[PDB]
Design a protein around this ligand. Structure first.
Ligand code: Y33
Length: 243
């Protein structure tokens, strides 16, 4: 149309292989500079926190009220040297809280749960707190978008109230009655490095547009670009207008 051009025009300034996928429940639409990324599998990096919190609440290894206390050994960011609920760590994207969670689940249950839901290639290897940060788990942008679409709908294979709790841990902001939910990721432990911005817009018409930005990253890049680009795209799409 003209909005496709407006969206693709945004990507004409981006000096990085990038793809942006949308899923409204019927149609996958793809935009960006390297459309083949949408079908390529990459480490989920911190976007796996979504599936990690689901599996862990579903299997009685944590609650969303439980405090994950700081054990004193300092952390990569100094904003991490605190106590966190699972929701507070989801939006701080605190990795050691969610590695502790994965150790609580264990490799056996982690593997069988990932098979049970069909997440990515469902591979975890031998390090139960490392597979999403360095492989072997990989997932395509198209898989991430359907996954978070079903989460928005409450249609993942989990107790309805577990989905609702992980859903609200992702909540970012609202504009009128439209609600943005999102989770960023930056996988530095792989070559190439992969950037994620996955989420969905819940409209007032009970309707959902899921989205997944996926792009290549290099050390030094603007950490704010993933979100600012995805929000630009959503506004050109008319899915989540600027106010
Ligand atoms: C997640 O994918 C990644 C690794 C460590 O699991 C993580 C948490 C590092 C970064 S970069 C940096 C950390 N938090 C900052 C941030 O979110 N803001 C808003 C300043 C950026 C990310 C990331 O996605 O940015 N994820």
């Amino acid at each position: 149309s003209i909005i496709d051009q407006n969206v693709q025009a945004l990507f004409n300034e981006i000096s990085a292989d990038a793809v942006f996928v949308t899923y409204d429940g019927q149609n996958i639409k793809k935009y960006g500079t390297h459309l083949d990324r949408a079908k390529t599998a990459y480490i989920p990096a911190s976007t796996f926190k979504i599936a990690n919190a689901l599996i862990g609440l579903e299997n009685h290894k944590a609650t969303s009220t439980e405090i994950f206390k700081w054990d004193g050994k300092p952390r990569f960011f100094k904003a991490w040297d605190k106590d966190f609920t699972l929701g507070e760590a989801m939006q701080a994207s605190t990795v050691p809280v969610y590695q502790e969670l994965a150790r609580r689940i264990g490799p056996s249950l982690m593997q069988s749960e990932l098979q049970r839901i069909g997440y990515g290639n469902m591979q975890i290897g031998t390090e139960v707190d490392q597979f999403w940060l360095k492989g072997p788990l990989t997932i395509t942008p198209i898989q991430e978008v359907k996954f978070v679409y079903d989460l928005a709908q409450g249609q993942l294979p989990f107790k309805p109230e577990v989905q609702q709790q992980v859903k609200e841990m992702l909540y970012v902001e609202r504009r009128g009655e439209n609600r943005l939910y999102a989770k960023s990721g930056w996988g530095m432990a792989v070559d190439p490095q992969v950037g994620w911005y996955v989420g969905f817009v819940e409209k007032a018409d009970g309707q959902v547009v899921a989205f997944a930005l996926n792009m290549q990253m290099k050390a030094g890049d603007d950490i704010a670009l993933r979100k600012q680009l995805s929000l630009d795209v959503l506004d050109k799409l008319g899915v989540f207008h600027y106010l």
